[PDB]
Structures are given as C-alpha cells and as structure tokens.
Amino acid sequence: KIQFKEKVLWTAITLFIFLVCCQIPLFGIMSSDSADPFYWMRVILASNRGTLMELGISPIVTSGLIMQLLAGAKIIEVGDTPKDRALFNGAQKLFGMIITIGQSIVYVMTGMYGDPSEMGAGICLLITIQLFVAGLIVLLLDELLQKGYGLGSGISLFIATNICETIVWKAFSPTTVNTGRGMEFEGAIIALFHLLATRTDKVRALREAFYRQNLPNLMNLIATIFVFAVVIYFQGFRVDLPIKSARYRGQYNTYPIKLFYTSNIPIILQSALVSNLYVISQMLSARFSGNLLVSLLGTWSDTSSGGPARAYPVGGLCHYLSPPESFGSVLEDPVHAVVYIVFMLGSCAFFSKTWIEVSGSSAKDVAKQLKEQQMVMRGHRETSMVHELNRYIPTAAAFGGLCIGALSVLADFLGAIGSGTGILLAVTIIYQYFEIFVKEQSEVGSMGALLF
C-alpha cells in the first residue's frame, strides 16, 4: 500500500536487523579475507554493510531495481506469458525474484556437481548467510507490499546509516596503537598523552606538543565540514509562484521544490556502478578468458578496456576513473584528474535526463497532480497547458544532479576521512533523506522514542 509514512517505517525496522547480523561476518574464529582494499567502492557496497568480506547485503539493494525492470516496462512480446492458469504483474514480480537469486549464487560457494561457477575468488557462503537473514526480511517485505506494483523509499537510508557505524567500528579496531587513549580520535597518539586523554577534554588542540606521528584522524574531523556548509545552502534555493490556491476557499500554502530535489537520486546510482566496476575489472582481464592477444590489438596505448600488462584495476575504464588514488594528494597527472572530472560530469547529466521520463518527475506528471489538488487553475491561459508549466522542469532536473556530480569528484581530493575516499556519498544522502522522512509524512515526523 502507498503511504509516505509506511514506506519510511518499513526501511527503519529492517535497518536494525542489519547491525545484529553484522558481528559474526566481522571476525569469527581465525577467519581472514585476502585482498579487496579501497574506500569509494566500500561506501557504495555498504548498504548497511561493512568489514573485510565483500558483498553481504549487495543482492538486496539490487532487488528494488529489478522490480522496476518489468513492472513498468513493455515491448519485447511475452506479455501475459504462455504460462498456464494466468495472472500477470505478480508473475513479472516472481521473475524479478529469480534474477536476484541468480546473482547471489555465483559469489557464494555451491556444490561440486551442478556447480557452473567458481575456480577463481568466491566462497563466503557461511559469511553471506547471516546478512541474507536480515536482507531476507527486506525481500519478503518487498514481495507482499508490492503485489506486482511497488516503489518504496528504500535506497537512501541503509547506505547513509552505515558510515556513522563504520567510524565507531574503526575506533574499536586495533591499529597497533599503544593501549588506549580513552577518547581522542582512535589512533596516532603517543603513550604519555594516552593516560591523560581519558580524564576529560583538556590537552588536545591547546597543549604543548602532541600528535604528528602519522595522523589519519585530524583528516576525519575537517572532512565533514567541507560537505556540511555547501549542502545546506543548496537545500534552500526554490521556485514557488502559487496564488489563490486550493480552488476557492482561497487560502494559500506555498508549493516548494528545491530543484536539487528529484535530481539527487540518479547521482547516487551514477556513483554506484562506477566504483564497483573498478574493484571487479582485475578478474575479467587476468583470470577469466580470452584477452591475451585481444588486449594488445585493442589497446593502441591511448587507453582501452582490458588493457595488457596492467597491475591494480585494468587500464581503460579504471584509468580515466582515478590517478594513483593517493587520497587526492597526487593529482598533477595532467591526464587522469582532468578526465575523471569530465567523465563523471557527463555521465551524471545523462542519468538526470533519463530520470525525467517515467521514473521520476516530468512536467506531464506534475500537470495532472496540480489539476487534482487545484492551484485555482493556476491563473492560466485559454488552454495551452502543453507548454506553460513545462520549461523549468527539464532544466531543474538536469541542474540539480549536475552540480552534485561535479562537486563529488573534487570533494574526494579535498579530504575524505579515515577512509580517505569514503565519506562524501553517505553524508549528502542524510540531508535528502531527512526531507523524505518528515516533510512527505505531511503531518508529524519520525517515530520511536515514546513507548508502546
């Protein structure tokens, strides 16, 4: 069922079970994970999920997109499917579930006979399963609630939550620092300082000498601030113009669109594919099939995908996507930093324009809505509705996401936190989510912190 209040609440109940599951995947027994490391991929990967072992919660985030794939599609004939009995839409939804399951199986180990995967890197079958129990309640919620047409405000809240958890997890992580400070920022602080530090705040910023060994953590505090000031400013611009409103009775409440609203959601997706692509590529090039001679032939040397003799993620797609990495401290590579900014900028504007059509806000959709809740007929002309309302809606959708996508690449350079790439994506989401949480609810706000 539709209801802004219901959709936010469902995401909240799920959210807790993510953390209860997490601890056993973390460190259990002697278990270790060999390679993976990076940050940008990790914040994306993190639909409430963190630690050394990859992709526990990952099929679950995906599932919502699968539902959109078919429920509001139609073209390639097989509508109403040659299936016995009948009953479509729910049938499409059932097909959607199968696609999610197929994705899951390949990562996890499977039995030797009928196996059809593996021989590379995988396993994590026990490790995945506890996350799967948390994410099963999400999947089951999606099945019932949707009934072949569904949407939901799932996406934003899970990813957003995780980074706050991660910073706390890092604090109790041992960095082979001396026995603990007892409340300075995790690590990098000498033994003499540590005994003092527990007692209360004094010392730290004003002192007589501290710190400086190999900081990791003064970078964390200043990271948040850079994002903090500009995000709030751009959640302030708006276009109004409504008068006489609600029909007669006449009484007016202003209609608000930020114009960074309905624009933000494509950008999160745009960041997400690219970061994942960078981690995976290594497997395709070196250890799958085919690309030995083919690599040499294709890669002229300018940069082409699955490039020969490339160490770290393969040259091509990855090569433009980043420079050393170096946490933004080496970027004077006139050829890497420049391409990174421009590629992301062009990709972001593409996904903003495709969001308009039938997956988000367009001027035709808004036309019908303002006919229902009646602006007073909006002051309007003799009929010529077709233009009127239209012109500032494609420009607004494009502009909103284009600004954020430009900013994100530069933001990595200025300073992400302990992670050094990870912060920026998560923080932006929390501000957007807060507006979904209370403003859409159209009455009161949050829930919890009461009892009963």
Partner: protein, 36 residues
C-alpha cells in the same frame, strides 16, 4: 506470486533467530562458552 498466502510470516523470522542463538554460542566462545 507465491503459493503460500501467509508467506512472509512472523513465525519464519522467529525460527531464523532460534537456529542462530545455538550456532553463535555453543559452537564458539563469546562469553566464556565452550568451543566445539
């Protein structure tokens, strides 16, 4: 859709937890438990 009509169930969620509690603690230490 699914052939069960009561599919999602409060009962399955409880069952998952019930299996889990034995697996966490009997098998391995977490509170000065025996390790199998």
């Amino acid at each position: 859709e699914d052939s069960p009509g009561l599919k999602v169930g409060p009962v399955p969620v409880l069952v998952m937890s019930l299996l889990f509690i034995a697996s966490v603690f009997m098998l391995h230490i977490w509170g000065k438990y025996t390790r199998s």
